[PDB]
Amino acid sequence: VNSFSGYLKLTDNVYIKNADIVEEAKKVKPTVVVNAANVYLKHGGGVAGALNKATNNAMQVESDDYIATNGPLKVGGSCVLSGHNLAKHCLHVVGPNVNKGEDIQLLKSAYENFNQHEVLLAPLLSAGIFGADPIHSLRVCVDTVRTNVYLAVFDKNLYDKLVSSFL
Numbered sequence: 676v677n678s679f680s681g682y683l684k685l686t687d688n689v690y691i692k693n694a695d696i697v698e699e700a701k702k703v704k705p706t707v708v709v710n711a712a713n714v715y716l717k718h719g720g721g722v723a724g725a726l727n728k729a730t731n732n733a734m735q736v737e738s739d740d741y742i743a744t745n746g747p748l749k750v751g752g753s754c755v756l757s758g759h760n761l762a763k764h765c766l767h768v769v770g771p772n773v774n775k776g777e778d779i780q781l782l783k784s785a786y787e788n789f790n791q792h793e794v795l796l797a798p799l800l801s802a803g804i805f806g807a808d809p810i811h812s813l814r815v816c817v818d819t820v821r822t823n824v825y826l827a828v829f830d831k832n833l834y835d836k837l838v839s840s841f842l
């Protein structure tokens with residue numbers, strides 16, 4: 676039993692809700708919140724910009740130190756950093772950005788990072804400003820993640836379409 680509330684159950688382990696991931700994180704304080712990161716951990720917009728703003732830029736300060744020490748992430752890769760006031764940990768995961776021309780096959784590799792954590796609050800990777808089809812992203816999530824994932828979808832119109840079309 677965990678503290679997530681109001682989710683529709685898609686599969687044994689995948690759940691979905693129309694919610695702002697920022698407000699959901701602030702309420703649940705999950706062990707792991709997933710960020711829709713880029714390789715430079717520059718949290719300027721989309722989910723990343725919103726999560727970082729909610730930390731009063733502390734996520735960005737921590738991220739800049741991480742990059743100065745370790746260099747950029749790989750597309751499809753991840754790193755674990757602090758969750759600040761939102762969660763215990765933030766798993767920064769880099770899905771391919773279609774608006775940069777990156778290989779959508781890397782989306783499965785991106786979701787594989789979730790399997791290192793028993794329970795996660797997460798957005799749909801490569802959706803939104805990353806330019807991929809969110810229906811496809813949900814399919815890859817369901818077919819790749821085996822741990823318990825609670826997906827927050829900000830756009831209500833998109834949420835209804837994802838549910839109505841789910842196989």
Ligand SMILES: O=C1CC[C@@H](c2ccccc2)N1Nc1ncnc2[nH]c(Br)cc12
Nearest residue numbers: 696711721722725798802803804829830
């Ligand atoms: O609906 C969706 C589906 C695609 C996803 C997204 C991911 C990265 C960049 C842009 C969009 N997205 N957006 C949010 N998903 C969850 N929580 C959110 N909070 C805010 Br603000 C936006 C937001």
